[model samples]
Target: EGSDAPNFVLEDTNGKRIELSDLKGKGVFLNFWGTWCEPCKKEFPYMANQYKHFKSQGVEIVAVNVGESKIAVHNFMKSYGVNFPVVLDTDRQVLDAYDVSPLPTTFLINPEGKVVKVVTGTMTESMIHDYMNLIKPG
Candidate 1:
């Protein structure tokens, strides 16, 4: 088995604290990205669409923006019309906890709060769905 993911409390776009522990028992697409990353920018809309379609099916996404200010994040979300939660990781503490050495590392967490897959680059919505199928709750 892989190492357990470190849990932390990060503030969302609305300035509310979101704890990773609270997201247990849900499939989490934990993405560590930045607003300036080109591939990351390209992948968000596709992931957003998939989230909209499958959120009711226990699919949840927590996007952690590394080293970006709240204003920058706000503008990006506004332009993209993202409805999911985007947590602020301005200090890179959370990224270090996850040992994320790259700009757009993505982690797929099962309902059990464990890392199942770690993509070091951008991900496609179909690939996310396939990963979800492997660990969806019955």
Candidate 2:
């Protein structure tokens, strides 16, 4: 039920530095997705909804944009109105780190830095809540 999640330091769309370790004491949802994936596009709004509803309760989401330019990501986010921090995996470093071969992959990390789940598919608010309930530190 517990495996150490690989640590990473990646830049968000705003160029702010972020590391897996910085969220050590909080639950993190690291989702891998591209702008071109239909299912990914569908899942984001739900994820953002969860983010807005639960962020103040210490849940953080890192939406990793895979292999895309900053402009593409920026435009997509703006058009979609996604509010969570979107990390740029322009070099695909995070993809390889997580062995993500699919278009949409999600990994939930507990407060203890252990990966609780690695899900590769479309997601829902209930699914997010299921994982959050498991790893919510507080």
Candidate 3:
């Protein structure tokens, strides 16, 4: 309820390095997921849909795949047809930094880069809409 999100720099699926700090001034939907988690399979599409809905409103979605190989993640993204930025947490550095214990842990960051909400589980369409209302930057 009262802390800045831990900053992280990781390589995206396309091999482009991205820094959390670089996304300031926009709301960030920081999600931690694993390829083996069943809930992740359901949650990713919801995240992708919400990303498309709110992206033009200054919201960014970044999914961090914990300890998954690049090939696995690339295939998963291809299979899911998810277009949002996905970064590999090869060493789980960002995973541990955020103290994430669940498969689909989502952090909603405000425009000022403050952690506003932490949701852990599959998000329904209604939940995605509601969370985006709280996280989307004005």
For all the candidates, what are their Cα RMSDs to the real structure? 1.3, 1.2, 1.1
Candidate 2 local lDDT, 58-121, one digit each (tens): 7788888998888899999997788888889889888998999987898889888889888889
For model 1, name the residue pairs that clash: none
Superposing every Cα of model 3 onto the true structure, what RMSD results? Answer: 1.1
User: What is the descending lDDT order?
Assistant: 3, 2, 1
**lDDT value for model 2:** 0.85
Predicted candidate 3 versus true structure: per-residue lDDT over 1-138, tens digit per residue = 548999999998779999998998888888898888898898777777777889898888888999989899999999887978899999999999999997889999988888989998888878988888887777
Give the residue spans of candidate 1 off by over 4 A: none
Off by over 4 Å in 3: none
Winning candidate number (lDDT): 3
Number of the candidate with higher TM-score, 1 or 2: 2
Candidate 2 accuracy as TM-score: 0.94
Alpha-carbon error at 106 in model 3, in Å?
A: 0.7
* Every candidate's lDDT: 0.84, 0.85, 0.88
**Which scores better on TM-score, 1 or 3?**
3
The TM-scores of all predictions, comma-separated, are 0.93, 0.94, 0.95
